Symmetry: C3
């Protein structure tokens, strides 16, 4: 049974946002590029203090009165080996192969700190910035929530699907099940939908360029509309006929494949450089870290932090509860100090590995003038430029297959987990473990695709960026509210 309380509002709005946008894709990019410019240039610092304060809680968790506190109070389900590996595995997606490949070009073209284009000082700081946006520092700002939920799930033995179920000890039962609790759940879902809808906007064009390389078929917006539909079908069949087995295997193979391609690119993409460059960019990270963390550039108005630093932070703000729930669900029976520790390590190892192998590889192709990225981007768009970095490797076809398969099924498990995440939080609380209403699952998977297409239809990265930054604005609060509950609540039932 559905919950009209949280079902109808987002479906209306997300329907409306499509309506106005799809009606005139010219005026949209005149406001898409106007909404983005506003938020980042005046509220960019808000995200950054958020990321430096949640960073404080990390040290407070590890070194506070809750450090040796054990959540759940029993033996863990997983061995540390499997447990760590499950985090290590969760770092594979479509958007990562996308960012892991091209992010270094944008750091090297128009660098931060007023450095010159393609300068050596810019190639120094190039990788080091990826290690910052995707390192132990944003992962640390997830620990407060992953501990929060693992606390609620296991210490307080409750069960939350929607975040409002956590705000009980700050606004009381009156507000929670009232209007206040629905305003946040309507927001959280809408912002979630955009965020997950953008993951498709990044995913499909990667998958289609692989297709264009292996099969020769022309990359068109009409083709992007196909694969998305085929993904809906693939998932619609998978849910209806149970098939929860096969999806898990595919998700397994995606992980084990991800290691092969990384190992591949690392092996033949100059292993000597990558190790050196990494080493050189770890020390460059640690030195400039407080500068990157508090960057706004108000005196030169370069636009770097606003472009990358705050937009990433908005991408991190969003998937907080989304991912912190996951980390909580698996960190059963552990103590909060060893959660935050094994988490940050195991995660960072996954993300650092990708950006250095893929990014350090991309740099070499720019360095050795093998490839002209600015030309490819102006002509065919971003995902083409990325695909050609993969193509500039020995055994291109086997490689492009290796990514094609990867970048494909990585989105299949993305859509399957998405429809689930929504339908559970969209319907009414049935018995836990049960599968969401088969039909409502489908509907969301289609509702996303429309957005994904539109985001592809508008063209460029700006719609993606603006969609997530927008969604990151309310979830800015929602995230703190969930933490403020734990902090308040744990002050009572833990000591």
């Amino acid at each position: 049974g559905i919950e009209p309380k949280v079902f109808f509002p987002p479906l209306i709005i997300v329907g409306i946002l499509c309506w106005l946008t799809v009606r005139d894709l010219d005026a949209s990019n005149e406001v898409i590029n106007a909404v983005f410019s506003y938020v980042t240039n005046v509220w960019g610092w808000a995200f950054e203090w958020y990321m430096v304060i949640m960073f404080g809680g990390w040290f407070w968790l590890v070194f506070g009165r809750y450090a040796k506190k054990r959540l759940g109070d029993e033996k863990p389900e997983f061995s540390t080996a499997s447990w760590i590996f499950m985090m290590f595995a969760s770092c594979t997606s479509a958007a990562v192969l996308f960012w892991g490949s091209i992010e270094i070009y944008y750091y090297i073209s128009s660098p931060p700190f007023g450095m010159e284009g393609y300068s050596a000082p810019a190639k120094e700081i190039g990788l080091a910035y990826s290690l910052f946006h995707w390192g132990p520092l944003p992962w640390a700002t997830y620990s407060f929530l992953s501990v929060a939920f693992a606390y609620f799930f296991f210490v307080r033995k409750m069960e939350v699907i929607r975040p409002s179920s956590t705000l009980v000890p700050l606004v009381g039962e009156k507000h929670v099940n009232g209007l206040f609790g629905t305003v946040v759940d309507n927001f959280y879902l809408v912002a979630l939908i955009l965020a997950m809808g953008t993951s498709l906007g990044l995913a499909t064009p990667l998958v289609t360029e692989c297709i264009q390389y292996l099969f020769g078929i022309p990359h068109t917006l009409q083709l992007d509309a196909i694969i998305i539909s085929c993904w809906i079908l693939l998932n619609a069949i998978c849910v209806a006929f149970g098939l929860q087995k096969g999806v898990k295997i595919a998700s397994d193979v995606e992980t084990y494949l991800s290691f092969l391609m990384l190992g591949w690119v690392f092996i033949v993409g100059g292993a000597s450089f990558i190790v050196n460059y990494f080493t050189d960019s770890v020390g460059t990270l640690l030195m400039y870290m407080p500068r990157m963390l508090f960057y706004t550039d108000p005196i030169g108005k370069g636009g770097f932090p606003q472009a990358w630093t705050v937009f990433y932070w908005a991408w991190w703000v969003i998937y907080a509860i989304q991912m912190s729930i996951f980390l909580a669900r698996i960190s059963k029976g552990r103590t909060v100090r060893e959660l935050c520790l094994g988490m940050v390590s195991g995660l960072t190892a996954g993300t650092w590995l990708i950006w250095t192998i893929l990014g350090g590889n991309t740099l070499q192709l720019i360095d050795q003038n093998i490839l002209n990225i600015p030309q490819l981007i102006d002509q065919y768009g971003v995902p083409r430029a990325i695909i050609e970095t993969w193509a500039a490797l020995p055994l291109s076809t086997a490689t492009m297959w290796g990514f094609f398969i990867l970048c494909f099924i990585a989105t299949v498990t993305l859509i399957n987990a998405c429809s689930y995440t929504l339908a559970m939080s969209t319907c009414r609380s049935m018995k836990e473990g049960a599968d969401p209403p088969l039909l409502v699952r489908i509907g969301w998977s289609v509702l996303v695709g429309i957005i994904g297409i539109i985001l592809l239809a508008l063209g460029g990265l700006k719609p993606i960026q603006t969609a997530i930054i927008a969604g990151g604005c309310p979830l800015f609060f929602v995230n703190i509210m969930v933490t403020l509950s734990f902090i308040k609540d744990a002050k009572v039932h833990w000591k």
Copy 2:
């Protein structure tokens, strides 16, 4: 009853120092600018190691065997809210509005690290340096003494007026009440007198420029002599007729006003920039902090640390016992870890707030070419240039009133507290709580004014700088001696 032991010596010397100086104000500035150049350029590092070693004791206090040690051993007098606020309030003065306004111009004109004048790299480091000289780092070097006195006052239940009363457990009763104990008290008072006499040299010209703006009356040395005298009268009346009520209210209003003007300048002086710039200058601070802390420039001989970094340190060395006593008197019944913590935080919040609002505002006026600071300074002097930064705000007259009143009464409470601090430490130990000999109180307030006038008479900042750096030389030692007592003494009666 007076104490000729400590009364006569300083009165003689300070009388003499006026005599020689006021007799030929040309040769004075030939030695004023010669004494300054010597001390900073060869003993500048001495101050800095002092500030880095006392900084070490902070961490030793917080993380040492004295951390959870409680001084006084009872419930505190104040709630943390009031207690913190009392520190927050103590950051208002006349010299701060002076430095908070113009300090950034000197960092931006001739910057450190060999940077070019008015360069973007210089506007980056501009504010960040103020956050360093007036941040949690110099405040941390007060904690060792504030804990020392709060220890002596409350653990050892004694009562010190003069610092020599603390040196009992390192030189014994023979030296303390002998010649050694008087040499330091004669020094401590003389250096105190100069230091408090310089606070007037910074105060009056601010007050007079406000007068020149609102009333039109010409700023003259003859006018500076008036207000000072009127301040003596205002305080002479206030002490004689009790009036300890009204002074406390005025001191209250000064605080509550200080917030209004800051809030004002912050509201209409571009709140967007100030927040950004602050954020950008916090990260710039943390990154270059060990460089600023150990700066001497021996290879380029630029003269930056000597000019600002060591002169500020000398200003910090002086008011140590002066301020650490204050912090001790109020931190009653607290533990040394929570003193050092709430202190550094509450204080820094007060000082950081000022320098960023006032300094970040001043920069904008330079940036947008609204104002020409170097011209104003060459023509009318510093305090005029500062006044015009305030005048370049919407509702200038209401603003200039808001500062006029502020910058006025801030010096009234400064003179009232001064005469008290001296007369108590100048006379004999009466019953605690009693008011110092009514007449001797007046005499000191006049003895200061003569210096203040002379320091105004000599013109320029150099006499101020040289007067405090000179006073900071002996108090360099005196401060350590008081700490070495606590360290030695606490090793005995605490464990």
Copy 3:
């Protein structure tokens, strides 16, 4: 009685390595300069991660479950005053006067970070780099082994001469006394021999230039062959006739002399600058430290870290067990936290003192154009250039004596301790405290001299550098293996 197990192999190889090298000193420098270029440019990072991971164990020792653990479990033999001083004294040698003098010139000529030659930014970072290569950071990476041995010697009460006697709890008794345990001991000795043979290559030319200055006799390779032989004789007489008394006195005088010459150069070599420069280079160190620690320069290919940073690390990797044994033997009855603490402090104070006095002095001579280092080096070689820095001081002859004597006997105690270190580890385990077989002691002292001569014969620093880097490759492992034993073993008999 000798141990043919570990006697014959190194004697064969080291004999062979002389054979091939001494047969054609032209082709040798074509491979000497080829082996060096390979290892550093591709395995340089291996050394650096080693130095950053062992650096991690330091903090793990101080803050881990072994922190308050006491090794030996009794009162220490030495008072802390003597104990610290014994570390302070151990920092005197011939190679240090060599590196302490000329190292700053190489940092100032062709600086790191792509800085320009003789730039002010290069004179800033000049000293700060010495404080890094010879500071608390490489000393911290010795603590894990010094605690390891002090653990084995005193907790496990065993006695190790050869490192293989420590690998008992990871490869079992089968491997230890088998082939595996001999492969490492053959390696450890060979690499030791080269490392100690290089200390002579640095020592003699210093001693001979002093001779050329005081006595006028021409510096020739034939003369270098003399002094070395005379050193063998001096030690051959010293061992045969007991004389363990006189050697200890000479070693005492060398220490007490070392302070005189440092104090001398510090007194008349501009004490004002040295204090300033030091202060300025401590803050420069702390700021760039993570950059220096993780430097590889893969994007500019300057060659700085490979030249200095990895070659020093290889010099540190080697003397680990050599020096960690020493520190262990004296740190009897102490707790591991107070070992690591007093060690790092007492040591660094010794090394920092030298490089700043000698290096900060050398810089001034370059700065004030008193001396032309590049000309002297091209013409007479390095040790001449160093000698002239000493000669550019007031009372040159008394100074050059002061170094001559120092730089002489410093090598006498170096050869005496060397033959002992080898012969003990070369022969069979007699009763501890006994003197090694009188004859085999001599033989090694000669075997070294041949290398030293050859290393002088090949000319330049490259043979020295290549000899130690080569020896540092296997001992890279050996060092970890000894630590992995302690870590494993202490997990059992300590908790």
